[PDB]
From Swiss-Prot, chain B:
The keyword Membrane does not apply. Zn(2+) binds at residues 10, 13, 34, 37. Factor involved in transcription-coupled nucleotide excision repair (TC-NER), a mechanism that rapidly removes RNA polymerase II-blocking lesions from the transcribed strand of active genes. Acts as a key adapter required to anchor TC-NER factors to RNA polymerase II: stably positions UVSSA and the DCX(ERCC8) complex (also named CSA complex) on arrested RNA polymerase II, leading to neddylation and activation of the DCX(ERCC8) complex and ubiquitination of RNA polymerase II. This is Transcription elongation factor 1 homolog. The lineage of its organism: Eukaryota, Metazoa, Chordata, Craniata, Vertebrata. GO terms for molecular function: protein-macromolecule adaptor activity; RNA polymerase II complex binding; zinc ion binding. Changing residue 39 to A: Does not affect transcription-coupled nucleotide excision repair (TC-NER). It comes from Homo sapiens. It is found in: Nucleus; Chromosome. The chain holds residues 17 to 83 of 83 of the full protein. One of its GO terms (cellular component) is nucleus.
From Swiss-Prot, chain F:
Interacts with SUPT6H; binds preferentially to the POLR2A-bound SUPT6H. Interacts with ALYREF/THOC4, SETD2 and PRMT5. Interacts with HDGFRP2. Interacts (via IBM motif) with PSIP1 (via IBD domain); phosphorylation increases its affinity for PSIP1. The chain holds residues 525 to 819 of 819 of the full protein. The gene is IWS1. It is found in: Nucleus. Residues 75-153 form the TFIIS N-terminal domain. Phosphorylation increases its interaction with PSIP1. This is Protein IWS1 homolog. Residues 160-171 have a biased composition (Basic and acidic residues). Signal peptide: none annotated. Transcription factor which plays a key role in defining the composition of the RNA polymerase II (RNAPII) elongation complex and in modulating the production of mature mRNA transcripts. Acts as an assembly factor to recruit various factors to the RNAPII elongation complex and is recruited to the complex via binding to the transcription elongation factor SUPT6H bound to the C-terminal domain (CTD) of the RNAPII subunit RPB1 (POLR2A).
């Protein structure tokens, strides 16, 4: 997971989190010359 | 000659490699489910039984039922 | 390394439901002694019997006794596998192994006891397990051990006499097939100063990079000097220094 | 085997510091051969004061 | 078996006393040459369910040139050492403000404990040895030459005489059996005095990294 | 008092917004209005394009997409996608990133599209002649994606239930050699769905495996033999 997705990094004038997007990462696999992404 | 198949085309929705086999060696039963249309079939297996045998039992039940 | 297989002559699995009238006539005379004073709950003895008879040649050749083998069997398995044995002075060296049952298996009056295997097939498994995996004597990974009175002086002990003469001493040295340098080195009566593996990877794991440099230079000198030819010590020392410069065994690959 | 050896030691040499370093200038030996002498000039001898 | 277990406990203690003496802790000749009979007489003879319980063997010893620098040797009774055990030793150390400890584990110790040992590393330096490794003092072996940890004042000199960046010396890894025996940590330098069949003697150095 | 062990453990353990979203939307409106003023002055409209990175980096936060949509992000995006006073299109980067974001912002309800006018703002770019072909494809697919729900259609094939397919399949039903010959798979159209056709040893083996492990001549620190996986 791209941690820290729960927080707005820029305060827009209003210890530090990772500031990620919160998205679950794919596991990438190779098939000869083609790359495939797989989400569990 | 070559390596045995482990993913199959759903005999109903024909979506390729959409069906996978779960083998419950404990209850002696194999379960196949289409990850697309969710169709399922279950058949009694033995220790010799491989995924290709389950898929075949599914095909034999379909071929017998579609008459 | 001496496994139960190494000393075993024959094994047999019998349906012997009552040891007090055992199907094996040779054993009735001595089996009574263990049931006359049972060290185990006789209600738990399985009717299937695994009788193992040991080869006296292979037993005395390595100073083994029935009591030691029974100790090893009881330790490796436990309360669940009772072992009975003949006296070492009898004509035939025999062990009588039986599976001990369990009260937890009695409590399931109607549940499907699928986790329990048939005793006769279980004994055949325990035999195939115990024969090749039951270490009775020795160290694993050591296939065989030769005994030798060194001839090369570098294998003989050399110790200075009070008057200064070097006076090599010939001492029994064991030359193994397979290695386990740390265990062999810690055995009592094994000289820990000189015992060596002739296997540089072992040297790195057991004695470290500098020890590796020394051991590698000696083994390389050994192969290069086998046919009697000579190479100046500079070339060996340089090769071993580069292979150990970075603190690890840098392969020439 | 000979290729492997040369490719592994081709850069090791004696520097003017009389230390033996390599391409990375890592000191391998503080003196060549632990004594700093060339292989052509040394000879076999017997140590009388030994033994 | 009590006779074999007493032999092993005596042999590890003998190796630990030699390790402490070589690391420069203060150990008396009587502790250093103690025989097995004299061990049985002091710590007892029945370790299975009896007198030399491993908590009874702990050594506390003081650096020969600074009596405030002290090292515990702990012999856990637990076959496999866990975080909770290390916590006990860390507390007993903090109470005594002893910064060094050596854990002679019987089986291995848990990856979590192996971590906590390095996690405490800046304030409390505690390190581990399998008892299987202490049955032999590896420095006694004929292959192993004499390692000497160099003090920093003299490594400055070493690097200045040879006009040599510390990165250029031969290396030794801290996990090395003798980097472990002498207890050295990276960036520290080991001097090495080796016999030589062409020079008679050869001194070399190894940076711990 | 705390032990140094607990201080260390606690220290390491210590390692493990709607207002700021609203303020972001406010800043997006301020940026688009300032770009309108700058465009009237015939100056380069840099404010939107200067804020774009900060905005895109936040609209991607999965945990906030609901907050973003419900806070009026669609209205602000409509303002940024809308042409300027001289009826020029926004910076290429703005169209590229906002169209891509909209594809990644699927929770948008019909009332949200109708009220914000984002649909009009994308159909505009889809028709517009100065729009690049890739942006026209993105706008085209967006328009299809957003209009399908209006007509109840859907494009997720994994979204149709099992019974729906079984029923549809019934709705669509009609009225020598010297060597072994490889047979070929059945082409038959399967309509009907078939009824289903429906330890004491491992404890001692684990004990022996443990005895084997216990016998090993292990070391406390795994020495790297050839320099592989060297630490630090
Ligand atoms: Zn991310």
């Amino acid at each position: 997971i791209c941690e820290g997705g729960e927080e707005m990094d820029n305060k827009f004038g209003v210890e530090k989190g990772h500031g990620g997007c919160g998205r679950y990462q794919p596991r990438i696999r190779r098939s000869g010359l083609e790359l495939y992404a797989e989400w569990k | 000659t070559g390596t045995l198949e482990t993913q199959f085309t759903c005999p109903f929705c024909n979506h390729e490699k959409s069906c996978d086999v779960k083998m419950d060696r404990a209850r002696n039963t194999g379960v196949i489910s289409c990850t697309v249309c969710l169709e399922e079939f279950q058949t009694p297996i033995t220790y010799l039984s491989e995924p290709v045998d389950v898929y075949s039992d599914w095909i034999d039940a379909c071929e017998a039922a579609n008459q | 390394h001496t496994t139960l297989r190494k000393v075993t002559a024959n094994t047999a699995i019998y349906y012997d439901p009552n040891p007090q009238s055992t199907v094996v006539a040779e054993d009735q005379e001595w089996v009574n002694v263990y049931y006359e004073m049972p060290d185990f709950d006789v209600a738990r003895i399985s009717p299937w019997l695994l009788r193992v008879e040991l080869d006296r040649k292979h037993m005395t050749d390595r100073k083994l006794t029935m009591e030691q083998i029974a100790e090893k069997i009881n330790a490796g398995f436990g309360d669940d596998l009772n072992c009975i044995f003949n006296d070492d002075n009898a004509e035939k060296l025999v062990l009588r192994i039986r599976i001990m049952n369990s009260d937890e298996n009695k409590m399931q009056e109607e549940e499907e006891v699928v986790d329990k295997m048939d005793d006769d097939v279980f004994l055949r498994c325990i035999e195939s397990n115990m024969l090749t995996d039951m270490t009775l004597q020795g160290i694993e990974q050591i296939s065989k051990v030769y005994m030798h009175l060194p001839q090369t002086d570098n294998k003989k002990k050399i110790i200075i006499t009070e008057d200064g003469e070097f006076k090599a001493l010939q001492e029994w040295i064991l030359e193994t097939d397979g290695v386990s340098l740390m265990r062999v080195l810690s055995e009592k009566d094994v000289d820990p100063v000189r015992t060596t593996s002739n296997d540089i990877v072992e040297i790195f794991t057991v004695l470290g990079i500098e020890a590796v440099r020394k051991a590698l230079e000696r083994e390389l000198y050994h192969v290069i000097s086998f046919d009697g030819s000579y190479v100046n010590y500079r070339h060996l020392a340089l090769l071993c220094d580069t292979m150990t410069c970075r603190g690890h065994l840098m392969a020439i690959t | 085997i000979q290729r492997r050896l040369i490719k592994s030691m081709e850069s090791v040499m004696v520097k003017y510091d009389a230390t033996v370093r390599n391409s990375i200038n890592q000191v391998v030996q503080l003196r060549y051969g632990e004594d700093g002498l060339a292989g052509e000039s040394v000879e076999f001898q017997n140590l009388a004061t030994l033994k | 078996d009590d006779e074999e277990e007493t032999y092993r406990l005596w042999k590890i203690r003998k190796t630990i006393m030699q390790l402490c003496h070589d690391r420069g802790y203060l150990v008396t000749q009587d502790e250093l040459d103690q025989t097995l009979e004299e061990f049985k007489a002091q710590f007892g003879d029945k370790p299975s369910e009896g007198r030399p319980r491993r908590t009874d063997l702990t050594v506390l010893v003081a650096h020969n040139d600074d009596p405030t620098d002290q090292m515990f040797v702990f012999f856990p009774e637990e076959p496999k050492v866990g975080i909770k055990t290390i916590k006990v030793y860390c507390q007993r150390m903090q109470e005594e403000n002893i910064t060094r400890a050596l854990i002679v584990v019987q089986q291995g110790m848990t990856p979590s404990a192996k971590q906590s040992l390095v996690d405490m590393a800046p304030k409390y330096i505690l390190e581990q040895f399998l008892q299987q490794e202490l049955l032999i003092n590896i420095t006694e072996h004929e292959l192993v030459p004499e390692h000497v940890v160099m003090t920093k004042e003299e490594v400055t000199e070493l690097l200045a005489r040879y006009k040599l960046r510390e990165n250029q010396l031969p290396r030794i890894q801290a996990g090395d059996p003798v980097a472990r025996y002498f207890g050295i940590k990276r960036g520290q330098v080991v001097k090495i005095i080796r016999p030589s069949e062409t020079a008679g003697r050869y001194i070399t150095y190894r940076l711990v990294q | 008092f705390l032990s140094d062990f607990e201080m260390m453990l606690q220290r390491k353990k210590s390692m493990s917004a709607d207002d700021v979203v609203s303020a972001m939307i406010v800043k997006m409106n301020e940026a688009a209005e300032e770009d309108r003023q700058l465009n009237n002055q015939k100056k380069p409209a840099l404010k939107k394009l200067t804020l774009l990175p900060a905005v895109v980096m936040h609209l991607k936060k999965q945990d906030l997409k609901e907050t973003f949509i419900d806070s009026g992000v669609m209205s602000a995006i409509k303002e940024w996608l809308s042409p300027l006073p001289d009826r020029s299109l926004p910076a290429l980067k703005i169209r590229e990133e906002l169209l891509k974001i909209l594809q990644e912002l699927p929770s948008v309800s019909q009332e949200t599209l109708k009220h914000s006018g984002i649909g009009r703002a994308v159909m505009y770019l889809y028709k517009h002649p100065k729009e690049s072909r890739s942006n026209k494809d993105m706008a085209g697919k967006l328009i299809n994606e957003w209009s399908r729900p209006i007509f109840g259609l859907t494009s997720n094939y994994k979204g149709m239930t099992r019974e729906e397919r079984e029923q549809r399949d019934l709705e669509q039903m009609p009225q020598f050699c010297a060597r072994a010959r490889v047979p070929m798979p059945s082409n038959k159209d399967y309509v009907v769905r078939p009824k289903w056709n429906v330890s004491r040893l491992d404890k001692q083996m684990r004990k022996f495996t443990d005895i084997r492990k216990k016998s090993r001549s292990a070391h406390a620190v795994k020495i790297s033999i050839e320099g592989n996986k060297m630490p630090l």
